[PDB]
A paper describes a structure:
ChtII is a GH18 chitinase and possesses the greatest number of catalytic domains and chitin-binding domains in this family. Here we report the catalytic properties and the crystal structures of the catalytic domains of OfChtII, the ChtII derived from the Asian corn borer O. furnacalis. Analyzing the domain structure of the predicted protein with the SMART tool revealed that OfChtII contains five GH18 domains and seven CBM14-type chitin-binding modules (CBMs). The other two GH18 domains (C1 and C2) are predicted to be catalytically active (CAD).
OfChtII-C2 was also crystallized, and its crystal structure was resolved at a resolution of 1.95 Å. The P21 asymmetric unit comprised two molecules of OfChtII-C2 (which overlapped with an r.m.s. deviation of 0.24 Å over all atoms). OfChtII-C2 showed 60% sequence identity with OfChtII-C1. The overall architecture of OfChtII-C2 was very similar to that of OfChtII-C1, especially for the conserved (β/α)8 barrel domain (residues 2059–2301 and residues 2377–2426), corresponding to an r.m.s. deviation of 0.63 Å for 358 equivalent Cα atoms. However, subtle differences between OfChtII-C1 and OfChtII-C2 were observed. The entrance of the substrate-binding cleft in OfChtII-C2 was more open than that in OfChtII-C1.
Numbering used by the authors:
A (entry chain A), B (entry chain B): 2056 to 2438
The structure:
């Protein structure tokens, strides 16, 4: 239990064409120390946890089917929030009202125990910077969020439950949102969302999760290494920091004649994948199909500062492969951090059918480094 | 029937939470003469129609569930394109290549018959002006699109299938994009997208779909009455023209101290609604909740040139209500046009729960005028 492997399971992965469909039965519990059930949501009116999908989570028992995996020795927490649920002021209204926080904490304990959860993972995106609009929220969101965490910490300790949070990798947002010393002390781990540094919103190609500074960078804080050191320098316990790894790529459509390099101007997200059906986004296995079957070209950084990207016509997608997933896990071990986090189980090649690298190659690579699981070498996409 | 009521059904309304969820079972076929399934997409590599959501459209048979409604005496067409599929050059590569057009047409007939579709609705936004960027596309997009339409017409007539298109209401785009006489002759109807004349991109408040010239207008072509007469003057058969009506509002966040009037400076789109969850956009039923429950104030034009708008704090949304929907249908009858188009079914108060005016009040009002369906009177939002 020296290093954690925190696995995000997403309930909406069931609503996917059969080859992409991911159910509780697809979880390999040997590959996780902790599983986060993403996502529950905050009721706008009552400001308490509620299921976002009663039909799957409750009627079809997906909550209980995932928490049942604790018989395998994994801890199973409920994730609250996410990007989509963080629109608007409801989380700000919760944390800035003392009586609302108290109602939330009491209800949360009962909700979690009702379904067998070992605790709660907070994924408010973000305190003050609601959906990264920092002018939107009050400055008091930072202190209100810290107070919610402290009060959840005290109530959870009476129950032996775990409390974690997924947090921003943006220096700007971190400065606005987080009392870093208080969060480090009161959380069992801090999952750094060290991805989505770049995407089609930049209007030019960029890597979803740069590891180190690149010479083409315009901001030297948009990389995992800065993010981790910034949290440490802000007062975070290194063992509390869990470094997220994206199991998906950010895709782009490149302006005609702009080339295939980093920073090339773009006009849209990439064409949607068959399984994930979201322009701007491709699962790792959809990227494998493009490289293996559709002839997309893989571009690598000889300096090892960013992971690969793949191209075809004006399409362009950046992503982490086996080698960068391995490096980031080895970075976690070298830096003596708390572990690695996976976003998300269902976007890995969990069936093994797309990449030819065995089942769940990205997650297996992380477990190899952090937990000593014997494993095959990293697979070369291009091969 | 003398007048058509062309209903857009948007499949990814299925993913909306709570009462915003809209399924094929929510379609009332008696309120439509033609149903368009929005949307399929153009495969970038093969340049043929493909499903945009295999899981809903094919695995769960939503295509066939909607085309099965033709037993009610309605025609069901597949819509291709839409705004999001119209970025980049893929439609331009199709229409400017003779062999690609032939492959597309042959495949399209088989694709439509496979799922029981009665025909195809083309929603390329837009020939030449790709996503209204007129510098991007070649002048030859106009002629290529007309040739595609002509060739689809020939093949569809062998099968008794219908062919339609949704087209721009912008004079500039119309001049660049459409061989109006050829389209009028070869299409079973032309759906004028007579909405989105104004929105947050203007950086000031304006009505989503002005009917007539208003004194605050800076451009006297940005209204439905001009668009319709412009298509007629360009050579369109009046019978072929179908006037679109928006079932949603364009929302704005207004500069502090700028007031609530038309043309007031804005700094962002409006806050997203609970169910449609898109900044700058609110469904009619979301607008009803705001007026009925949240105390938003309704502002009307005594001159009848634009529909209402609603305000609360710095929020501002313009929309068509029952009275303007009725007027636009009565305009269709007075002008002896082809009918009205509804964009889209799922944004109406289709459950009847938000406005208290019965199920699908906007669509019922249009059917009342154009098809003589008995109906309740228009509901006054303010009551
Ligand atoms: C992630 O983010 C971090 C925070 O932003 C980055 O942290 C920075 O990392 C560098 C380390 O590379 C560190 O820089 C200094 O570290 C100590 C200061 O305490 C210095 O000794 C270092 O000086 C060495 O390197 C200099 C090169 O710039 C050189 O000028 C200097 O003379 C000395 O050279 C030795 O080391 C080199 C590298 O091994 C050799 O090439 C060179 O020949 C010298 O080697 C000899 O001496 C060594 C002992 O000094 C010995 O080991 C060797 O065998 C041989 O005998 C250096 O300037 C920053 O301070 C640090 N910043 C913070 C805030 O921590 C981090 O880089 C980033 N990671 C990545 C991958 O980007
Ligand atoms: C949608 O977009 C279109 C753009 O193409 C706009 O089209 C324009 O529509 C106007 C009408 O709104 C049309 O105007 C002329 O139509 C004919 C000319 O052929 C005339 O009959 C009209 O003249 C009458 O109105 C004049 C305007 O005030 C007036 O000066 C004139 O003396 C005459 O007045 C009579 O009619 C008025 C309206 O009923 C009365 O107020 C007035 O007292 C007079 O009524 C008497 O006479 C009537 C018989 O003429 C009789 O019925 C009545 O009982 C009484 O005894 C008019 O000028 C434009 O030609 C046309 N433009 C184009 C380019 O096509 C359209 O307006 C727009 N819609 C909206 C809502 O904006």
């Amino acid at each position: 239990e020296r290093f954690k492997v925190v696995c995000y399971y997403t309930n909406w992965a069931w609503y996917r064409p059969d080859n992409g469909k991911y159910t509780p039965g697809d979880i390999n519990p040997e590959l996780c120390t902790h599983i986060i059930y993403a996502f529950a949501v905050l009721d706008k009116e009552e400001l308490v946890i509620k299921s976002h999908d009663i039909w799957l989570d409750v009627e079809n028992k997906f909550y209980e089917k995932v928490t049942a995996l604790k018989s395998h020795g994994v801890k199973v927490l409920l994730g609250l929030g996410g990007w989509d649920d963080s629109a608007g002021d409801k989380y700000s209204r919760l944390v800035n009202n003392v009586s609302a926080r108290r109602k939330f904490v009491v209800h949360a304990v009962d909700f979690l125990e009702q379904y067998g959860f070992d605790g709660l993972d907070l994924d408010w995106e973000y305190p003050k910077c609601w959906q990264v609009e920092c002018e939107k929220g009050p400055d008091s969101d930072k202190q209100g969020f810290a107070d919610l965490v402290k009060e959840l910490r005290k109530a959870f300790n009476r129950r032996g439950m775990l409390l974690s949070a997924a947090v921003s990798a943006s220096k700007r947002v971190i400065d606005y949102a987080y009392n870093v010393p208080a969060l480090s002390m009161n959380l069992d781990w801090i999952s750094l969302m060290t991805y989505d540094y770049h995407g089609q919103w930049d209007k030019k190609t960029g890597h979803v999760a740069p590891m180190y500074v690149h010479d083409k960078d315009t901001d030297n804080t948009f990389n995992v290494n800065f993010t981790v050191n910034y949290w440490i320098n802000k007062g975070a316990d290194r063992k509390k920091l869990v470094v997220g790894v994206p199991f998906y790529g950010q895709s782009f459509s490149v302006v005609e004649g702009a080339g295939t390099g980093l920073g090339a101007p773009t006009y849209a997200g990439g064409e949607a994948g068959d399984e994930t059906r979201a322009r701007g986004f491709l699962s790792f296995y959809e990227i494998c199909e493009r490289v293996k079957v559709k002839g997309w070209k893989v571009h690598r950084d000889p300096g090892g500062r960013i992971g690969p990207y793949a191209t075809h016509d004006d399409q362009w997608v950046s992503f982490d492969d086996d080698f960068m997933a391995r490096h980031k896990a080895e970075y976690v071990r070298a830096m003596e951090l708390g572990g690695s986090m996976a976003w998300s189980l269902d976007l890995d090649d969990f069936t093994g059918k797309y990449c030819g690298c065995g089942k769940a190659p990205l997650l297996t690579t992380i477990n190899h480094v952090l937990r000593g699981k014997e494993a095959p070498p990293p697979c070369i996409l291009h091969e």
